[PDB]
């Protein structure tokens, strides 16, 4: 693993989820969201085969596909942190924007925010704690 | 460069300052700060030669000095930003957490926070924009 | 381009030929080849694009095609170089060897060998000097 | 570890040595050798901290040091394997052109030819397999 890996934003409750494998390229994501962020899922590609990872949190809220086109590509990610309920700590929203559009904000905007602009790199896959919810939140970078 | 490049958070005034090198490590940062942040200037390693970035911004505030012992690297770095007086968005506060002590906060923290854990890599350097002050930051990572 | 660039092996003739791209993934080869190699063309993957490099060389000696499958990767080049007819040097064979099967050798194994085995990476592009045959070889490696 | 990692050259017999670390520069190499390479030694450094690697291999042949100065660094790598005495493949010579100077060949060069070319990056670390004698040869790269 040549990659950058960024994390956690969020809180230290859930489980840790994690990649097994070697990402060039995020393909699609899966949210799962309504107050907070319930679940995440995303393909990514190794050595051109398609490999999904995911899902991981619950089945709540509504769901919402992005399925990034050829040329397509993450130029930053931003949420907010914060407790949500009996939750001390966990991921409220993620917005994802690409060199083409804004995906989100996804859940609530409440709480701290974070943000990570990339300037030179690709954004290639995910990782987290969850439970029920999506208690932390984690990026890995490629790159450019 | 095999290097992932966040930014910027901040602003959009003063002047794009950057590195000219290839950094493999960090050695030495000297902040510069007081209600903001005033200026930047950091040592890096290049195939075993130091070299001297900055000094970049203002010679307001006072100096303080980081010197990285050797081991010693860098976990995570927080900070925030938004106006000062007569300027809409720059660089207020920086925080610099080793594997050994935290470094700050530098600042004032008022305004909009950013954090960046890193789970897997070595920050390596910086770049921004600078004018009298800090307007904008950013870090250069080297995979782990 | 965090690419670890290796070569040339052979000559100093006819004229230097490069991508221009970031590649993460190698999709296939076009060789021709008889007693020396004649030509290279090869596709590459970058941001879920696919671009075409070359050809670059003659249209000399006979086409093969290497079209690789979802999961298949080169693990090892192999090749010779030396003198042909007025050239002092240049790429007499080249012989690709995937994690499935092996293609090759192209042209023929006289001269001076070479041999790039790969333990951790992938081969993701290549470049050299061409003229109406390839006077030198070149491979772009990405951390695996 | 987002090294390139090359290899093996040379035969199958001796035990697998290898690092356990992140190299960022290769300061120093000592080498064994007379009619093959009798052993290899060298400091990586890490996080600003100097680890010796080895030494791998025997106590025969005569010593040789390379001191690596600032802003020193291999652009190639030379060698060749083969037969020796009751081995069936092993490293007979190695050949280290840094920037500044070139230091060998060590051992003698006879057997098959191979040969490291660097376009874009550096060398920082070796491995291979080691009995009384080096085996077999390999080489960790970083983007540069
Ligand atoms: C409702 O509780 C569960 O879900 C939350 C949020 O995911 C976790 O914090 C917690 O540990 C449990 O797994
Ligand atoms: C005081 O004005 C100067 O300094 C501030 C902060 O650095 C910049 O925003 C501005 O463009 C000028 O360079
Ligand atoms: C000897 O001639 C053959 O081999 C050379 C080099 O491969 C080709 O250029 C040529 O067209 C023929 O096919
Ligand atoms: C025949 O001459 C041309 O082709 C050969 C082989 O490619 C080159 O060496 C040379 O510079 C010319 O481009
Ligand atoms: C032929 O003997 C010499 O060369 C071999 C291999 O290099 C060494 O092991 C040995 O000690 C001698 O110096
Ligand atoms: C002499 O025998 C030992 O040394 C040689 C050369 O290193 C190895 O091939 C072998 O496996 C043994 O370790």
């Not at 907070?36 to 596909?65: P, R």
């Not at 701290?112 to 029920?132: K, L, N, Q």
Request: net charge neutral; no cysteine; aromatic share 12%.
């Amino acid at each position: 693993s040549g990659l950058v890996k960024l994390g956690l934003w969020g809180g230290n409750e859930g489980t840790l989820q994690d990649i097994d494998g070697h990402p060039t390229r995020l393909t699609k994501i899966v949210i799962r969201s309504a107050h907070a962020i319930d679940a995440l899922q995303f393909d990514y590609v190794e050595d051109g085969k398609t490999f999904a990872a995911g899902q991981w949190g619950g089945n709540g809220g509504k769901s919402d596909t992005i399925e990034f086109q050829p040329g397509e590509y993450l130029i930053a990610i931003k949420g907010t942190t914060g407790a949500l309920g009996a939750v001390t700590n966990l991921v409220r929203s993620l917005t994802f924007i690409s060199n083409m559009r804004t995906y989100g904000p996804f859940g609530l905007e409440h709480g701290t925010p974070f943000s990570v602009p990339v300037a030179s790199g690709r954004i290639v896959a995910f990782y987290g704690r969850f439970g029920s919810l999506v208690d932390a939140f984690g990026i890995y970078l490629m790159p450019y």
